[PDB]
């Protein structure tokens, strides 16, 4: 049982997913094509998280999760890489309308009850990466 | 309201004052107004725990000298050179 | 540490919800991870059910104010309360499926009508449907 973050339409190279999951006992060709067949609806250039559930007979079952909070704040502000020193250096800006956009997508994984509860959980991910709310 | 209990001193001077402290007590003076100054002795452990609160040095305190009640205000305190103790207190009639 | 000002406030917050709610469910929740609990918290808020873990000593104080003054004997061991403020039932069914599917705990006692319900007869508030069923 391992947790990984593979691209929307990319799953096969050796340095990121190769011997990380293959060391346990997972088929490198069976998962690499079943994952991209279900993540075809997900937009290009968006890292999507996936959790693997392996049994004693080397068999596997995966459930796809919504893109990360520190991932969606980069495309919304227009940045490739975050700040080296957060709250000391400002790299971008995101409005109150963009905060609720990241929160409505993350609703499947978030613990919050109301929209305001899920919005504040993205507000903290933005402050901790240098991005200022404007 | 801080209530201090005191007795008038039967003696004065070095020898007599050193004796008070050795007996876990300390001398103190009450002066101010038309009245003559009053030399009193105070219990050390009681007055120490009181002066620990900052309100002691600001508020009006009442001194009980043989039944009588005197309203005062702490004017000047003499402390021990290095121990957490009191050597003498100047009280002023209010 | 819980000051008495905090303790009285926890007594007050649960004494208020007690008056308003219709069906209250009392159970054990020892040996269950937060993953399964945050899940039973989502299924509760959805069904109009209030979910809390309160000191058994502090429960005997917020229940004394009537009509749950028969849940006293249910305040021995880990206690979890399910106060249903919106539509009677909800929890009494939500707990029965969570108990069987997770195997941990047993569910102490149920309360409705200001009357005591034993651990064996919780099938009474579990068979009740909607409000919203009489039409």
């Amino acid at each position: 049982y391992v947790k990984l973050q593979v691209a929307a339409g990319m799953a096969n190279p050796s340095p990121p997913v190769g011997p990380a999951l293959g060391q346990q006992g997972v088929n490198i060709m069976e998962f690499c094509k079943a994952f991209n067949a279900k993540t075809d609806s997900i937009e290009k250039g968006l890292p999507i998280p996936v959790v693997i559930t392996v049994y004693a007979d080397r068999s596997f079952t995966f459930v796809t999760k919504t893109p990360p909070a520190a991932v969606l704040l980069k495309k919304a502000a227009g940045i490739k890489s975050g700040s080296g020193k957060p709250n000391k250096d400002k790299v971008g800006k995101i409005s109150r309308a963009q905060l609720q956009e990241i929160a409505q997508t993350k609703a499947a994984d978030m613990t919050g009850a109301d929209i305001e509860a899920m919005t504040r959980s993205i507000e903290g991910t933005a402050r901790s990466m240098g991005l200022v709310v404007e | 309201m801080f209530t201090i209990n005191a007795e008038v001193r039967k003696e004065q001077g070095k020898g007599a004052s050193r004796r008070l402290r050795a007996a876990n007590k300390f001398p103190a003076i009450i002066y101010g107004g038309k009245e003559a100054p009053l030399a009193i002795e105070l219990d050390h452990d009681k007055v120490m725990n009181m002066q620990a609160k900052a309100e002691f040095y600001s508020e009006v305190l009442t001194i009980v000298v043989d039944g009588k009640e005197i309203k005062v205000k702490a004017q000047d305190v003499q402390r021990h050179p290095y121990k957490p103790k009191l050597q003498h207190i100047d009280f002023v009639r209010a | 540490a819980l000051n008495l000002q905090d303790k009285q406030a926890i007594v007050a917050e649960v004494s208020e919800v007690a008056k308003g709610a219709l069906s209250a469910v009392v159970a054990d929740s020892r040996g269950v991870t937060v993953d399964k609990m945050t899940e039973l918290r989502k299924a509760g808020r959805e069904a109009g059910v209030y979910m809390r873990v309160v000191r058994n000593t502090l429960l005997r104080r917020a229940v004394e104010g009537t009509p749950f003054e028969c849940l006293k004997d249910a305040f021995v061991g880990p206690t979890l309360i399910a106060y249903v403020t919106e539509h009677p039932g909800a929890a009494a069914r939500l707990f029965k499926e969570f108990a069987k599917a997770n195997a941990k705990f047993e569910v102490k006692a149920a309360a409705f009508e200001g009357e005591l319900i034993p651990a064996s007869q919780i099938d009474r508030l579990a068979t009740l449907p909607t409000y919203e069923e009489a039409i």
Binding site: - | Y57, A74, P81, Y82 | -
Partner: protein
């Protein structure tokens, strides 16, 4: 390392260190390190202590040194007989009577001041106590 810039005279008579300290109260900061012992604090000792407490507070807040080593100390070297004049000045001390507030500090929480003062006390030849600023 503290030392007087100029002096009226070079060498001082030995003297004595009787009596109690003048300057017993925390007069500039919020906390203090008070002398319980009687002795001499050298210019090096003062610096050693000052450095320890500064390193501790991460050079936050403010420190005061209420003592100044204005006393010159002479010494005769090896294979030198008695007399033939007073020895040469080698180091400087500050005469310390019980009660002297040696160091003062503020701009730090009580817990840190205590720790800082604990570290500096280890570099001192005389016993010390922690003292707080008092109303009168």
């Amino acid at each position: 390392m503290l030392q007087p810039k100029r002096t009226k005279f070079r060498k001082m008579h030995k003297g004595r260190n009787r009596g109690l300290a003048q300057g017993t109260d925390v007069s500039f900061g919020s906390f203090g390190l008070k002398a319980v012992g009687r002795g001499r604090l050298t210019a090096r000792q003062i610096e050693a202590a000052r450095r320890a407490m500064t390193r501790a507070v991460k050079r936050q807040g403010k420190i005061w040194i209420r003592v100044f080593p204005d006393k010159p100390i002479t010494e005769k070297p090896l294979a030198v007989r008695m007399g033939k004049g007073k020895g040469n000045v080698e180091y400087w001390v500050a005469l310390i009577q019980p009660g002297k507030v040696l160091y003062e500090m503020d701009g730090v929480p009580e817990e840190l001041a205590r720790e800082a003062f604990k570290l500096a006390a280890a570099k001192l030849p005389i016993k010390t106590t922690f003292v707080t600023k008092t109303v009168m």
